[PDB]
Amino acid sequence: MEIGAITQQIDAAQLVLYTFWLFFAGLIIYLRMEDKREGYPLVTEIPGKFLEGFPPMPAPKTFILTHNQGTVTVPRAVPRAEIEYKAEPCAAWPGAPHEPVGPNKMLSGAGPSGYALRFDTPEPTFDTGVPRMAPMRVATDHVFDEDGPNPIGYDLVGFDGIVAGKITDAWVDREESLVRYLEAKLTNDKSILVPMPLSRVKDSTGQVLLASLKGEQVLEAPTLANPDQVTLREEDRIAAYFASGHLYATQARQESIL
Amino acid sequence: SITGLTEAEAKEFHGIFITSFIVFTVIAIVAHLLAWQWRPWLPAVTGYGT
Amino acid sequence: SITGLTEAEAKEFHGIFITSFIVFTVIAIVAHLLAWQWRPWLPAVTGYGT
Amino acid sequence: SITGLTEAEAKEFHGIFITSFIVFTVIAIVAHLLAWQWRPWLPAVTGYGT
Amino acid sequence: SITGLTEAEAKEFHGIFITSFIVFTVIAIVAHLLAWQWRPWLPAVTGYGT
Amino acid sequence: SITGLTEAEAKEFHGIFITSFIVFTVIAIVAHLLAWQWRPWLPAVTGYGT
Amino acid sequence: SITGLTEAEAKEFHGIFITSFIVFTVIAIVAHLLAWQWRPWLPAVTGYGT
Amino acid sequence: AMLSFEPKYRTRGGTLIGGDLFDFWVGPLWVGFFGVTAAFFAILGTLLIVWAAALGPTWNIWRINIAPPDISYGLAFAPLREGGLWQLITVCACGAFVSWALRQVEIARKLGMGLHIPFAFSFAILAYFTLVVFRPLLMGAWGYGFPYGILSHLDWVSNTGYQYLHFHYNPAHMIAISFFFTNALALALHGSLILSAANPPKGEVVKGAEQENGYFRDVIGYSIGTLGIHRLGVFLAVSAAFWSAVCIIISGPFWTRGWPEWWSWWLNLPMWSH
Amino acid sequence: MNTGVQAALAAAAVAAVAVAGVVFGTFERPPIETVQRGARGLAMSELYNPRFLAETRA
Amino acid sequence: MAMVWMWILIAPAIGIVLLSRQ
Amino acid sequence: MAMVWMWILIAPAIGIVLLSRQ
Amino acid sequence: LNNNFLDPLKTTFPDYRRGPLGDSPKVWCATCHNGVYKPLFGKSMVTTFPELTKVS
Amino acid sequence: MWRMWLLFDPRRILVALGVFLFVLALLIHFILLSTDRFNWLDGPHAAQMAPLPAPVK
Amino acid sequence: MWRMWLLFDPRRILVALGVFLFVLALLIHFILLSTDRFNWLDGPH
Amino acid sequence: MWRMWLLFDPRRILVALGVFLFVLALLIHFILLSTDRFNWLDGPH
Amino acid sequence: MWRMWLLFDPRRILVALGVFLFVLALLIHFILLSTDRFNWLDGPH
Amino acid sequence: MWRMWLLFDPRRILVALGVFLFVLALLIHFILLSTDRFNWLDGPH
Amino acid sequence: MWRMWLLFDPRRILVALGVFLFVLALLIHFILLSTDRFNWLDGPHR
Amino acid sequence: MWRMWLLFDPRRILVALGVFLFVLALLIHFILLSTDRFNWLDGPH
Amino acid sequence: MWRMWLLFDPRRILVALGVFLFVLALLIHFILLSTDRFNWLDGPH
Amino acid sequence: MWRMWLLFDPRRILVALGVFLFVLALLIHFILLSTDRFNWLDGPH
Ligand code: BCL
Ligand code: BCL
Ligand code: BCL
Ligand code: BCL
Ligand SMILES: CC[C@H]1c2cc3[nH]c4c(c3C)C(=O)[C@H](C(=O)OC)c4c3nc(cc4[nH]c(cc(n2)[C@@H]1C)c(C(C)=O)c4C)[C@@H](C)[C@@H]3CCC(=O)OC/C=C(\C)CCC[C@H](C)CCC[C@H](C)CCCC(C)C
């Protein structure tokens, strides 16, 4: 009585297991190929040498976008242009880091201050081509919920305690009905946007705390091309500027702390 | 400087830090001298043997 | 003044911190003195011996 | 004044805090004295033995 | 040149690569000669048989 | 150059690298001579035999 | 220099590093001399034998 | 080699220890001080595992078994051939895991990201520390750690589970499994929804938040949203590891009987007690 | 504070106290006596609560 | 030995008052 | 059998040194 | 023990000594062991009672 | 020495020290309670008569 | 060597050193407590 | 046969070869140590 | 070799080097304490 | 062979070599300690 | 039936047919091996 | 049949053929090894 | 068959061939060691 | 002592005090009920 025996040593459960191994090997190959739809082929320290690795890059696929903003094919035959970042290499051999230049490293475009050249148009809503992100002075159908903080009129404070300006309006996502940006009137009359994920609303003291930038560094933050909408590229610029402060705001933040 | 301390403040902390290290070491030395009297360590290979 | 205390407030806090530590240590010393009378520790190598 | 109180409230709260602390401790002292009468702790090394 | 090396560099690396390979192999050959003398492998079907 | 080193610095580091390797190897050779004297390895097939 | 150290600072730091290593190693050498006196290592294949 | 967009991001800084000395890349990997430390512990620990295997009776990968010391050794360091090698490998593993987490902190700082990833990984480290140090420490013997072996450590799990005769009744075990099962359900739902929106039927436009939130409101009456689902994914996975650590730390240090017997507190509540 | 938040915090507070009651009212504690009976790492051993064992021996 | 607990309870209490009247 | 160790430990060191002058 | 000694005593036991189904009370492992790996931790009480070690 | 409070926050030091001292004192009391000699509640005072199963290594 | 404090915040140095010293001191005390000879509470047995 | 280095990157070859050879050498030494005959430390028993 | 400190700050390697030396010394002390011969607390059994 | 330094960065080689040498030395010292014959602390059983 | 290739892609059909036929062939061969009568390697399993 | 290559890329077919043939050949060799009669290494029991 | 290199990248094939041959050779050596008859180190027991 | 209501809200004090006292009373009543001596429903045993 040997049910499931194929030979004296090979049985049915063993064969099913090896069948799975063949499938799983193919699945990992498929998944790794899908991983290579962005950033490939790799660039080296040679003007025209590119590596695609193993497994190779997959065949192109096309995304159709809403509201006549075009078609996107990945992997791109010609990759998107990179920003003109300003940094000086710390060494000549491959694998060495570089040091951003300029008095304001958050504007260098290097390290965490870099950003992608996304679409130079606002992200539209699906139902209507209306910009997805809008100030609450324009999106009057959105109001702040009670039993939650209202940051309008609060002071914008850097991590050094210097007040950079006052919060004037909030930008909401018309699709998800949530706050994504706080608009602040700076002391130089600049009207910049600050990312909500990088803002700590202290409703006890009426302050919006920035742990990433000093008060004076807020004054050099990017400004919108037009005051009632923000493009996808501008969203990347604003996020990169504020977030790079955690490494570039002070010289201490870039060095080893222990 | 990166830390923000001046040269004078850095010297002042180092003087206190070093002299506080010596005080801790001296108290530890007296503690070990007392501990040795209570119970010596480093026995012979045969044992302590009272 | 990386924290926010003035020089005088640093003097004030340090003065009463020192005596608070002293009073806390003094109370502990008497507590250890009383605890020793109830039950001594640090026995001889042969044991406490009743 | 990170607390938010002037120096007037500080001595006001402290004076009430101390006297409340005294009342709490004195009651606890009486409770422990009664507790000792019912069942003493801190036995001798040979036990309680009533 | 996809590798980025020049023809002279390719000549130079290849010569150094081959001589390094020969030196590594010759040392390994002598090591295996000494290893065989110490303890031969590839036994007969019955066994090494002392 | 890939490393970005000129000939002068490439030669200079190789000189320091070689002498450091030689000193490290020579110390290891003496250690192995003393180790073999203390306890030889590579026994006969019948064991170390006393 | 990318560290911001001057010529004099580099020499001073190097001098501190050298003397610390000599002091640390000398203390270690004396410690091993005492340790060998207390309990020698590297036994014979028979053992230590008292 | 670097990704097409990578070169601008390779800045100096973000390290916690060392600074510029170890701040470089080898191929795609950044090293840093903890990369050196992680590499050292990983290589030494792996080499000791192979040496412990060499001392064992088999080279079969599934049957290699490196066991902890005897219980009688207590908290002492055992001889290497009698569980001392297991202890060294454990120390290397602890060093490798902590260095990996600390290396991730430096990498996230170099990219200006939050520290959520190393935070989530720290709960996995906590579970391992519970298994090999915390639980053995409370029991007073390193012999309580699980042996290092692909199939042999399943034997430890099985025998450990039956020391309480029905391990399913462990209450923290039930909670941890509920988190593991829900996390897999949440992962399947989240992966499906993104792929369904990004990959509609051929020729159809890609779908966004309106369809993503609309899909689960239609099927279940509520959508947690894109931010909520990624919060939920961390919370479920982290709590699965946390309650796993709880379920094993209470098994033996805080409970020595069969786990079903523990539920007698519910059976004996005075509202319905027999 | 929002009423839904208050209810959630109150429910969480009740659960935490209830969990504390169950945990402190049922769990044992170290030290625990272990009697190893199998091979190292095979998790074949006997557990004994010293307080329970003292009562059992009596 | 009522005194053993007597100091460890009363003295920190009298310690705070005497400390707070400097 | 000191020859086995002496060759494998020392000869690669010489080979590196003599290759170093190429 | 249950088949040959306890069960045949069914009629001898009064009804309040029997189960809800009327069967005689029966022995299992815990009747002797009472929660210990050996009854009374292996301590023997029959060594001085030889009459309890032989069948008449 | 007093100048340290220009460098260390008194709010942090007092809270951190308070937590440290209580946990340490709680640990020391529990250690003493676990000892036969220094247990002050039940005090000090059968394993060979009722032995556990023997270890099998 | 006082230049160390121009690069590293003495707050971080002191806290890290203090934690290291305390954990080391706890380890040595616990090791001695686990020995028969150097146990000062229950003493030798 | 020298144009191969105009085809294959020497740096990647040397690193891969170095890792491959050291891992292989470690594996062979370890296998011999596991055997009774070729163990050169404790030897046969 | 004082030139080495013009490239890498010696202040930024002390903690890394101090950690390395401590862990090495802790390993050696623990190994000796585990042996019967070199246990300096309870001594040979 | 001085040409490797124009093929490989000296700093990255030294850190790789330093880890490699320390691991190998630790491995061999541990391997000897796990043998009866070459245990220099407790010696043969 | 030539009109079905105006409805279905020949490349997909052949790839799907090739996979299906091989998996079916593998299944039948393994079924026969598991039997005693049609095992052509050793025969009855015993 | 020459127009099969007007539908399928020869690179796609050749890689698929090589993988398929090797896995099938590996399977058959392993099946024979598992039998008593056709094991060519250890032979019949 | 010289035309095969007008279809596949010679570098990718040689790397793939090199990996395939070593894994197969490693597989065959391991199978022989596992057998009693063809074990060349310890031999037939 | 009447000034404690200038520091705390009587709404939160009365709610917290009421919940605390009830849960405390519930805890004490149930503790007594679980004891044989102080069980007031079925009595001892
Ligand atoms: C075994 C024999 C003896 C014994 C033998 C010895 C010997 C020998 C020694 C000690 C020493 C100590 N013993 Mg003992 N000891 C025994 C049993 C005890 C018992 C007890 C309950 O029985 C207690 C309470 C102690 C207590 C102590 C400590 C006071 C001290 C450890 C120093 C330390 O931890 O520094 C670590 C903590 C610090 C250094 C504080 C941190 C300072 C930092 C650097 C400055 C800034 C701090 C910053 C603001 C805050 C961050 C850090 C915070 C701590 C988190 N011992 C037994 C009875 N003991 C040592 C000593 O005397 O040292 C002075 C010592 O040499
Ligand atoms: C074993 C023999 C004795 C015994 C021997 C000793 C000895 C010896 C000592 C004690 C000491 C103490 N014992 Mg005792 N003790 C015994 C049994 C007891 C019993 C009992 C139920 O039987 C009790 C209730 C106590 C109680 C106490 C405490 C009063 C005291 C520890 C204070 C402390 O933790 O400071 C930690 C807390 C602080 C220091 C407060 C921190 C203040 C900060 C700086 C200000 C801000 C606070 C911050 C913001 C918030 C933190 C507050 C909380 C601490 C979290 N002991 C037995 C009977 N006991 C010690 C003592 O008397 O100390 C004076 C002492 O030396
Ligand atoms: C069993 C009988 C003998 C014995 C039999 C043999 C035999 C037979 C051989 C050896 C060989 C070796 N033995 Mg032996 N050996 C024994 C016991 C030992 C013991 C010991 C503790 O007992 C030690 C330390 C050694 C050590 C060694 C090495 C010196 C050598 C392996 C070379 C190597 O791995 O290159 C690996 C490293 C490289 C190849 C790097 C070279 C440059 C690379 C290609 C470029 C750089 C790449 C990149 C930058 C760095 C990556 C690699 C790095 C090295 C990490 N043997 C016993 C006693 N041994 C072999 C030998 O001598 O070969 C020459 C050999 O054939
Ligand atoms: C049991 C009795 C005999 C035995 C019975 C048979 C029988 C019967 C046959 C073999 C055949 C083979 N045997 Mg045999 N064989 C035995 C034992 C062995 C042993 C051993 C260690 O004992 C080895 C190493 C072999 C090896 C081999 C192969 C040389 C050969 C074909 C297998 C193959 O994979 O081709 C498949 C792989 C290919 C054809 C390559 C595909 C080429 C592609 C189209 C172009 C390149 C594609 C791509 C770029 C690269 C390939 C993909 C990757 C490699 C994955 N046999 C025993 C002793 N053996 C077969 C043979 O001789 O065929 C000619 C055969 O019919
Ligand atoms: C906490 C929620 C879950 C979780 C999360 C999690 N895991 C993570 C992360 C996160 C967030 C990472 O960022 C990190 C990562 O980078 O992954 C790619 C990682 C990771 N989780 C991993 C594995 C892993 N996680 C597990 C579990 C979990 N991880 C949790 C359930 C498990 C289980 C359940 O078994 C495994 C096996 C790794 C792939 C990776 C961390 C890799 C790492 O530690 O790198 C450094 C160390 C080495 C490369 C090798 C060290 C080798 C040792 C020195 C020797 C071996 C010791 C070991 C004890 C042997 C035991 C063998 C036997 C058990 C068979």
Side-chain angles (χ1 to χ4, degrees), chain K residues 4-22:
Chain K
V4 191
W5 130 70
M6 283 168 53
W7 175 262
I8 309 174
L9 172 53
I10 302 175
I14 308 182
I16 292 183
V17 173
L18 302 187
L19 273 171
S20 301
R21 76 194 322 273
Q22 190 177 338

Side-chain angles (χ1 to χ4, degrees), chain E residues 1-48:
Chain E
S1 187
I2 52 179
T3 301
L5 255 56
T6 65
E7 168 172 345
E9 291 164 326
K11 296 296 296 182
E12 181 150 306
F13 180 82
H14 182 64
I16 298 183
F17 183 91
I18 291 312
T19 178
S20 298
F21 169 80
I22 292 174
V23 169
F24 186 83
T25 303
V26 166
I27 299 170
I29 291 172
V30 178
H32 281 78
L33 287 174
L34 300 167
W36 183 269
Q37 182 185 14
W38 168 67
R39 193 80 85 256
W41 56 97
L42 295 153
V45 187
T46 52
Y48 292 97

Side-chain angles (χ1 to χ4, degrees), chain U residues 13-34:
Chain U
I13 293 302
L14 290 182
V15 160
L17 186 57
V19 173
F20 169 80
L21 291 186
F22 165 75
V23 179
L24 173 63
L26 207 61
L27 170 66
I28 301 180
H29 274 100
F30 274 117
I31 284 175
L32 297 178
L33 191 63
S34 71

Side-chain angles (χ1 to χ4, degrees), chain H residues 26-43:
Chain H
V26 284
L29 297 154
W30 184 75
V31 183
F33 169 75
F34 296 105
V36 166
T37 296
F40 162 83
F41 279 130
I43 292 175

Side-chain angles (χ1 to χ4, degrees), chain B residues 38 41, chain H residues 75-77 137 142, chain M residues 31, chain N residues 22-40, chain P residues 22 25-34 39-43:
Chain B
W38 169 66
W41 52 98
Chain H
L75 295 178
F77 179 54
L137 204 62
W142 302 119
Chain M
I31 290 181
Chain N
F22 174 76
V23 173
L24 176 60
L26 264 193
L27 179 65
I28 302 177
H29 280 94
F30 269 132
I31 287 181
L32 297 178
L33 267 185
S34 69
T35 56
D36 284 324
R37 178 178 176 83
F38 294 97
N39 186 286
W40 63 95
Chain P
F22 171 74
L26 188 62
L27 170 70
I28 302 179
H29 277 97
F30 271 154
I31 287 178
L32 295 178
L33 194 61
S34 67
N39 184 286
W40 66 96
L41 293 178
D42 271 341

Side-chain angles (χ1 to χ4, degrees), chain E residues 24 27-28 32, chain F residues 42, chain K residues 8, chain O residues 14 18-19 21-22 25 29 32 40, chain Q residues 20 28:
Chain E
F24 186 83
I27 299 170
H32 281 78
Chain F
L42 289 165
Chain K
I8 309 174
Chain O
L14 289 181
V19 176
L21 292 182
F22 177 62
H29 279 96
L32 301 179
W40 65 91
Chain Q
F20 157 82
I28 301 178

